[PDB]
Structure 1
Amino acid sequence: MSDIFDEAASFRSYQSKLGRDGRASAATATLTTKIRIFVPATNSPELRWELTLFALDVIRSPSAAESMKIGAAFTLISMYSERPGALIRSLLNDPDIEAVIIDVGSMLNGIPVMERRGDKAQEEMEGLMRILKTARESSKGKTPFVDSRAYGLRITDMSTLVSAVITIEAQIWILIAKAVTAPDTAEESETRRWAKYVQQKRVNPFFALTQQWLTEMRNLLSQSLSVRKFMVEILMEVKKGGSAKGRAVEIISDIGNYVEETGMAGFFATIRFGLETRYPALALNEFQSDLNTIKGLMLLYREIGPRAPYMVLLEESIQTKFAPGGYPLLWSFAMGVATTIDRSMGALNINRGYLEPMYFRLGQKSARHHAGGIDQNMANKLGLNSDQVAELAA
């Protein structure tokens, strides 16, 4: 009767937020891994330049352990800040890892431990020398930068160090946009971002890393989750306005503008196209369940919080519920109308197992052959029937 079909809606709403309530216990505590991070102790430009060169070499090194690579990545990311240790310690929310901040102090060819020399330090020094030697020998004499003069470059001016560091941060931060979604199909959007930032003169093109180093760093970023979590935390903190933003922070926020809502193109495309742009072909007895699921998904997305846009980057378990597969019909309709309407829509790889070609064809027809689609008109267009006819005439 009347009561049923509403009890169903309440049941689905309750099932969506079924057990996602309360607070968990500390028993489910992940084992922690020690990660050694080399941060610059002082503000001298030469020390910071040598440190970032060392971090580039370590990241490029093939014999480097994963923990050393994560340490080098953390050193690189926090290089712009005047207090990298404070930035790392105050913007770390990774239960998987524990970070031991190490102030570099002075600067040799590698790093001088300067803590009980001879006792448990010489082995670390030889290890760092081996890492550097393997990094330099692995490449065919090619420096990490696309320009050989950028590697063996002496930096003593603060402005030059700042420019080079900003360029390195920009080139690193380009990769996060398509690091886990489709790392193989990258180097096109990344090149577009690099060209955009070069044309804006925000980055000096002299310090441009080669594509081999970029591929290695992207592979490291995709393999590791702690680096992604740290960078997402940095993005969230920068997104919060209120204070003055520096050049590095502004570049990071501009990149995060592209980073947001990555890996969830299906859901947002479904929203924008199938749900909005109201077409008379919506209520047809095969889209009502999908509409209810979509509404529940919007409520869940609002409930998640500030980490919702970067759900794929943090690899949230909630992301699976957002993926198409629970609403294949409306999703297929929406991507059909998207591919017919948006030219850019159509390069997306959507050869899934629930394509529903009938509904894709229905959406394709609904986009063009359906009708002009005159929605409720606040202004009284009494004589616009001929206008609608002319618009549909194309």
Structure 2
Amino acid sequence: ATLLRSLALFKRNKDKPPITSGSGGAIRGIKHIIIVPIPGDSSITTRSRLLDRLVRLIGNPDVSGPKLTGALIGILSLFVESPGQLIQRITDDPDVSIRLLEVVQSDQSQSGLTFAMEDEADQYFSQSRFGWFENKEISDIEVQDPEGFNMILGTILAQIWVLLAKAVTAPDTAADSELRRWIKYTQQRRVVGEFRLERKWLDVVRNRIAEDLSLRRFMVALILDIKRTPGNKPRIAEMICDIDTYIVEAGLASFILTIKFGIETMYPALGLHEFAGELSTLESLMNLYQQMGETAPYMVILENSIQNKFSAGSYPLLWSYAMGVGVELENSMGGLNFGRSYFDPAYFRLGQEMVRRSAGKVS
């Protein structure tokens, strides 16, 4: 029986994360200065004016790659006291150097904001192609109370964080799903229902989160910082960690649903010998998933190299069995597109057959 433990150790080394800290520092890329307009000063009034001048900055076809990513990092961190020590706390991206600039309110400037460069800010912040709210009776969302801005900012962030859930997996067919979360935070009284940003504003951001990678690394790594906050989180931060249950494991559902339907049901069609090698390369992917730490449900949001390893192509037979168990059990699995060049529908029909045979067949 010496072949067995020599086989299991063979799959616990080729299916092992490589050890690190071997690069001396000659892998770091050419940097890229990005511009994140942080809120200026203690006062609430200028950070509501900053949010107003930076939401309509995004709804603009004339904004670039870095100017839009720095605009989003500028508004995804307005919910904290002193956002400057949050951006440099979170960003460990090696391709983007944060050069973040303070924005203070003024009555001299055209937009109303200067940089702490009085009119140079007006070329930073400035009709049928400007993205804005759906109730476009709105002109400005500048307020002066703290709990007003806390509910407006919580409304704007709650429909940028739900973009992250399927900006990279189902970008085009995300419009119906993300509305069902907007309905969720409206009846929870988390957000205000009036201030729904339109299809064209969100399609700027959803296309942006999909097309660059350092914006997603900022959006993921602050979520991981929200989770570590021990006590009662602040209420926008609780909302971001509430949206997070839709963002985790988003793009690993050829692996999560393989576990949920192929493994956990335990039909008699797992003792097939053709699965016996593929239950071990799925056992080792569950050992690998929990030793990657808290960055493991985001491996395809962060789009690292290790999500090729959790792909269903390494277990093409036991995955198809789990799609057969999956679409026969739930109504919700009927909408899942599983179109791959390794499908083998003879085990998909064997997956459905074990469910239909075991209808009233208590084990």
- The reply to whether TM is greater than 0.5 is yes
Q: CA deviation at 1:91?
A: 1.7
Query: In 1, distance between residues paired with 2:352 and 2:235?
Result: 45
Moved more, 147-156 or 207-216: 147-156
Once the two structures are superposed, the pairs formed by residues 288-367 of structure 1 within 5 Å of their partners are 288-367=276-355
Is structure 2 residue 204 aligned with structure 1 residue 203?
Answer: no
- Deviation sequence 1:307-337 (CA, Å, 0-9, x none): 0001111001000010100101000001101
Q: CA deviation at 1:22?
A: 3.9
2:227 alignment counterpart? 239
Is structure 2 residue 255 aligned with structure 1 residue 267?
Answer: yes
Q: How many residues align?
A: 359
Q: Is residue 94–residue 229 contact of structure 1 (8 Å, CA) maintained in 2? A: yes
Query: In 2, distance between residues paired with 1:153 and 1:125?
Result: 19
Query: In 2, distance between residues paired with 1:22 and 1:148?
Result: 52
Over 3 Å counting, the alpha-carbon distance change for 1:356 and 1:154 in structure 2 is closer
Once the two structures are superposed, the pairs formed by residues 44-63 of structure 1 within 5 Å of their partners are 44-63=43-62
- Deviation sequence 1:235-291 (CA, Å, 0-9, x none): 111122522212101111110011111110110101111111111111111101111
Over 3 Å counting, the alpha-carbon distance change for 1:146 and 1:261 in structure 2 is same
SS at the partner of 2:266? coil
SS at the partner of 2:99? strand
Once the two structures are superposed, the pairs formed by residues 1-394 of structure 1 within 5 Å of their partners are 2-17=1-16, 20-25=18-23, 26-107=25-106, 108-110=109-111, 111-113=113-115, 124-125=120-121, 127-128=123-124, 132=126, 137=127, 139=128, 144-370=132-358, 372=360, 374-375=362-363
SS at the partner of 2:294? coil
Over 3 Å counting, the alpha-carbon distance change for 1:323 and 1:70 in structure 2 is same
Query: In 2, distance between residues paired with 1:12 and 1:114?
Result: 57
TM-score, normalised with respect to structure 1:
0.86
SS at the partner of 1:367? helix
Q: Is residue 39–residue 101 contact of structure 1 (8 Å, CA) maintained in 2? A: yes
Query: In 2, distance between residues paired with 1:306 and 1:46?
Result: 36
Amino acid at match of 2:354: S
Over 3 Å counting, the alpha-carbon distance change for 1:82 and 1:328 in structure 2 is same
RMSD: 1.9
Q: CA deviation at 1:79?
A: 1.1
Structure 1 or 2, whichever has the larger Rg, is: 1
Query: In 2, distance between residues paired with 1:210 and 1:276?
Result: 41
Q: Is residue 52–residue 140 contact of structure 2 (8 Å, CA) maintained in 1? A: no
Query: In 2, distance between residues paired with 1:102 and 1:162?
Result: 22
Query: In 2, distance between residues paired with 1:264 and 1:6?
Result: 29
Q: Is residue 102–residue 116 contact of structure 2 (8 Å, CA) maintained in 1? A: no
Amino acid at match of 1:112: T
Query: In 2, distance between residues paired with 1:32 and 1:276?
Result: 46
Query: In 2, distance between residues paired with 1:63 and 1:200?
Result: 36
- Deviation sequence 1:146-192 (CA, Å, 0-9, x none): 12243334522222222111101111111111110011001111100
Amino acid at match of 1:109: Q
Query: In 1, distance between residues paired with 2:35 and 2:141?
Result: 27
Q: CA deviation at 1:372?
A: 5.0
Q: Is residue 16–residue 296 contact of structure 1 (8 Å, CA) maintained in 2? A: yes
Q: CA deviation at 1:8?
A: 2.3
Query: In 2, distance between residues paired with 1:61 and 1:154?
Result: 19
Query: In 2, distance between residues paired with 1:373 and 1:10?
Result: 38
Q: Is residue 169–residue 251 contact of structure 2 (8 Å, CA) maintained in 1? A: yes
SS at the partner of 1:148? coil
Runs of 4 or more consecutive aligned structure 1 residues displaced over 6 Å after TM superposition:
none
TM-score, normalised with respect to structure 2:
0.93
Q: Is residue 58–residue 68 contact of structure 1 (8 Å, CA) maintained in 2? A: no
Over 3 Å counting, the alpha-carbon distance change for 1:125 and 1:39 in structure 2 is closer
Amino acid at match of 1:244: N
